[model samples]
Target: SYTLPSLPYAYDALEPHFDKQTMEIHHTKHHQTYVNNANAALESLPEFANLPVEELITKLDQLPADKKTVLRNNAGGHANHSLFWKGLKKGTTLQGDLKAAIERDFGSVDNFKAEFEKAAASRFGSGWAWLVLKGDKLAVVSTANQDSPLMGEAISGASGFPIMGLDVWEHAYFLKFQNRRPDYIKEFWNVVNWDEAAARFAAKK
Candidate 1:
């Protein structure tokens, strides 16, 4: 069965950018539900239980329609939250070839942040903003609810190797930030784990 990964740092590690209580509830409550529900869905199909988690979500169309919905929401939630957690590391910044790539692709570091924030802020409702590898080319995209970029190439018109993702769900930020999502987006910069993202980019290249 899939399980919650231990956080890379203390719940309070991200400090002012992400509050401790929010981390506690988001991980134990929100994230764990994804794991449990996804596992429950897989239990109904023994053949699916051993497949890699990403592979399972990506191939959901092969399953029966009744089995599809539970796995889509919960399995996608598991994959999305796993990356979202690892992509944050309290004090870090974009650097090295990755930094150059951001400039080369998105124009400049600041411009990339502007584009990313625009994607995050303009997400209408609960969703996510992502910077994913579409081959060596990087692309910014958004998806509603638990929909994952890993679903298929057709989902985004191109297959993606996800490098960075941000959860814009109200449960992710509403407690402390209230409705001030823009402020929350700005604060998120202080905790991006660029090293994790860079590694993902390297793997795809």
Candidate 2:
């Protein structure tokens, strides 16, 4: 059974940039709901229960048609939020291969940030923005609802191995930034866990 992954830090760890109340509710209530729903949906598909969440999402089309939607939303929610939690930190710097890759791909770190922010700010509703490894190249993309870039173009309309992601769902920011999504997007850079992103970048195929 898929389960909610524990946060490496406390709910208040991302304070100021992400409020404590929001973090707690987002993790305990919102994220936990996803885990529970995903597990419930997978109950009838015992053959697939033990698959890794990422693998399950990537093979979404291979699942039973009746169970696909719940798995997509809940499974995708599980994968996305798991990455989201690891991608957050109060302070972390960008350097090394990930730094060079961003510079090479986007021309400069500032350009990359602008592109990422644009993706996050422009998403129409509940969704996510990502910096993903598309083959050997990095790209900025957005996904609707609980869809993830790993779901590939057929499902998400864009595909890649996400190195970093910013949750644009209102639940992610409504408590603090309100309707000002741009403000939330801007503050995301402050709390981004660059070390985690760097590790993902380095490990990408």
Candidate 3:
């Protein structure tokens, strides 16, 4: 059974940018629902229960066709939120080679934020915006619904290990931004744990 992943920082730790109530509901309620559903689905197929979440996501086409969609959505949601929670922290900044790479590729840190924000703001509907490393280059991409960059073919223009991502689903921002998605995207910058993101980037093989 999948379990709720704990946030690296307290609910209120991202205050002034993300409110406590929003974080609580997003983590405890929304994310937990996905975890529970994913566990239930996996239990129905004992053979698949032992496989790691990453393996399941990367090999969705190999699963039973009837259960493919179920695992893809719920399991994907659970996995995405797991990493999403860890990708953020109270106060952190980019450092080392990752910092240099960001400046080199995007011109400056501010430019990278601008590009990321543009992608998030322009996303047609509920989805996630991501920063992923591919062949020694970092790129920004968005995925619709519970889909993530880790799952090949499920989402177009997305393939690789994600370094960081932002959830733009209404459930992720309604309580705070309330129809003001651009504001939510803008606020996300303050709570961005660049240190963790940089580490993820560097760890990519």
Candidate 4:
């Protein structure tokens, strides 16, 4: 069976920005739910059994319509949360090609941050904020609930490769920042694994 991945860093390593209890529960409970539910959904739709999670998400319309929603929610949740884990670590910074690209595309790091934070904060409810590549260009986008840039079609008007994401779901921050989502967004910078993000950006390009 597919399994939950271990956090790349200690659960408490993101402390102050992300509480240990929240990390523990979010990983063990919430994310695990995505994993388990995805596996269960796979049981009814074995055609996707051999596909990687990302492939399954991006090519969802190719599957049977009956199988789409379950896979969209569960598999999307699984894949989204999976990337989210690798997207964080303590003391990361923006640099190199990604920095240059941000400046080239969005004017400056501050401008990119402003746009990203706005997308994250303005989402009507639970969702994720993303820095996604739309072809050769990049955009700050939002997806509701477990949706991601990988889905590429209906749920999000913006799609391409996801270089980075910020989980604005209440479960992600209620324990630490409470209702202050911006504070959580601010603290999220401290743990962003920019090296990984930059690598994803380069690979997708």
Record all residue pairs in model 4 with backbone atoms less than 3 Å apart, i.e. clashing. none
Ranked by TM-score, the better of candidates 1 and 3 is: 1
Q: What is the TM-score of each candidate against the true structure?
A: 0.95, 0.98, 0.94, 0.96
Give the per-residue lDDT of model 1 (tens digit) for 52-165: 778887888888789888888888899899889999996576898888998999999889899999999999888888898876778888888888888865543324778888
Query: Which prediction has more favorable lDDT, 3 or 4?
Result: 4
Residue-wise C-alpha lDDT for candidate 2, range 1-205, written one tens digit per residue: 8777889899888877888899989999999999999999998887787899989999889899998899999999999999999999987999999999999999999999999988888899789999999997999999999999899999898898999999999999998988999999988988999999999888894
What are the lDDT figures for the candidates, one per model? 0.86, 0.92, 0.84, 0.87
lDDT of 3 by residue, 39-155 (tens): 888887877776877677887777787878888898889888988888878678677888888888889988888999999998888789998887778878888888888897444
The residue-level lDDT of candidate 3 at 31 comes to: 91
Enumerate residue pairs that collide in model 2.
none
Q: Which tens-of-lDDT digit does each residue in 63-91 have in candidate 4?
A: 78788888888888889889999999887
Better of 1 and 2 by TM-score: 2
Q: RMSD of model 1, in Å?
A: 1.6
Model 4 lDDT, residue 100, Cα: 94
Candidate topping lDDT: 2
Order by lDDT, highest first? 2, 4, 1, 3
Query: Which candidate order results from sorting by TM-score in descending order?
Result: 2, 4, 1, 3
